[PDB]
Design a protein around this ligand. Structure first.
Ligand SMILES: Cc1cn([C@H]2C[C@H](O)[C@@H](COP(=O)(O)OP(=O)(O)OP(=O)(O)O)O2)c(=O)[nH]c1=O
Ligand SMILES: [Ca+2]
Ligand SMILES: [Ca+2]
Ligand SMILES: [Ca+2]
Ligand SMILES: [Mg+2]
Length: 341
DNA sequence: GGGGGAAGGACTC
DNA sequence: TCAGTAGTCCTTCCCCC
């Protein structure tokens, strides 16, 4: 199997730069303003100019402004990024039927039936980068290897605006020299647990007692890491089918007053249904983000599709369940639909 | 024992 | 004073042949 992974460079910010060339060269920060107070919210992403001084995804907008008060701050316009993204994904389908869109700015192409070796794979990669640049003037990074995981690792190493191939030999090398925290799917929580086991490289997972590893990071993650260590990971590239559609919004102020939360909850339901398009969900979850930012969720699965009317009444039941089972104040409220017919 | 599922939370991105 | 809201897994409790 030969896999080619594509990840668009500093996507949200780059799109803004394509739509407004004068931004090129200046630090640009795409922001998610929450409305609670002046500059309240988080950074969605920033271009490399801004990222260079510590302004990156996730940090508070207020903090970004302390670091680069003169950077250009733009409100996130996800709809616009989504449409640009959709066009680029369509350019990708031309290179392979087997494509897995993993997020708004990345996808995997199984080009096994398209090239014969990495040399050709590399060229196809350059071809794809030129194509996207020509059509949308967007730079992306390509990663190529024997499976999805290493194709992604390949791209992470070559970004931004790059291209890299990790041949069979380098895969074996990485299984020994690569920091395990840099393996896709390993976050801070898991990385830390692994360090507490003396595990810092994929190969190390092979010298520990399975159940000990398992008992520490879960059966799935343990098996995942082990299969990679054994150079046995080979998950197929498959069409992604969205499994849930929802909306969660921050309220002007925290509260646990039903009548005061409802409007938001109902707004969330309205937007979610629009997104559902023609999909009919059999499950609904009311999601609350408490004042301390903990997440409390209560849902229900019905034997038949949920009409928007049922969604209204049922969501109110779930919200109250949360209210009676959690005394904290609610900061954000939303709904999430799944199990589509 | 294990197929099968619903529900709430953990972890990742 | 930290947005948003998807996709696995894991746990528990639980029905049932
Ligand atoms: C990470 C992260 C990304 N995003 C959005 C912003 C990004 O443009 C997009 C893709 O995430 P990356 O993870 O691919 O963000 P980036 O495109 O700016 O990437 P790079 O370092 O590869 O050049 O999704 C968030 O909104 N919040 C986040 O916490
Ligand atoms: Ca990405
Ligand atoms: Ca990217
Ligand atoms: Ca990591
Ligand atoms: Mg909690």
């Amino acid at each position: 199997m030969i896999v080619l992974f594509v990840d668009f460079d500093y996507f949200y910010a780059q799109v803004e730069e394509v739509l407004n060339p004068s931004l090129k060269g200046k630090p640009v920060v795409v922001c998610v303003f929450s409305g609670r107070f002046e500059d309240s919210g988080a950074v969605a992403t920033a271009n490399y100019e801004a990222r260079k001084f510590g302004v990156k995804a996730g940090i508070p907008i207020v903090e970004a402004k302390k670091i680069l008060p003169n950077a250009v701050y733009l409100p996130m316009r996800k709809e616009v990024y989504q449409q640009v993204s959709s066009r680029i994904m369509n350019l990708l389908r031309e290179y392979s039927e087997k494509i897995e869109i993993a997020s708004i700015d990345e996808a995997y192409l199984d080009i096994s039936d398209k090239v014969r070796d990495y040399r050709e794979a590399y060229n196809l990669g350059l071809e794809i980068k030129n194509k996207i640049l020509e059509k949308e003037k967007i730079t992306v990074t390509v990663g190529i290897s024997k499976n999805k995981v290493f194709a992604k690792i390949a791209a992470d190493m070559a970004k931004p605006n790059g291209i890299k191939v990790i041949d069979d030999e380098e895969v074996k090398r990485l299984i020994r020299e690569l920091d395990i925290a840099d393996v896709p799917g390993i976050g801070n929580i898991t990385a830390e647990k692994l360090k507490k086991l003396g595990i810092n490289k994929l190969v190390d997972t092979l010298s520990i007692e399975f159940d000990k590893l398992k008992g520490m990071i879960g059966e799935a993650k343990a098996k995942y890491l082990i299969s990679l260590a054994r150079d046995e990971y080979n998950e197929p590239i498959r069409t992604r089918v969205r499994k849930s559609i929802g909306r969660i919004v921050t309220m002007k102020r925290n509260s646990r007053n039903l009548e005061e939360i409802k409007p938001y909850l109902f707004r969330a339901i309205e937007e979610s249904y629009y997104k559902l398009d023609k999909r009919i969900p059999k499950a609904i979850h009311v999601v609350a983000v408490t004042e301390d930012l903990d997440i409390v969720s209560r849902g229900r699965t019905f034997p038949h599709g949920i009409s928007k009317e049922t969604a209204y009444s049922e969501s109110v039941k779930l919200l109250q369940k949360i209210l009676e089972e959690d005394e904290r104040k609610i900061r954000r409220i939303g709904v999430r639909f799944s199990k589509f017919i």
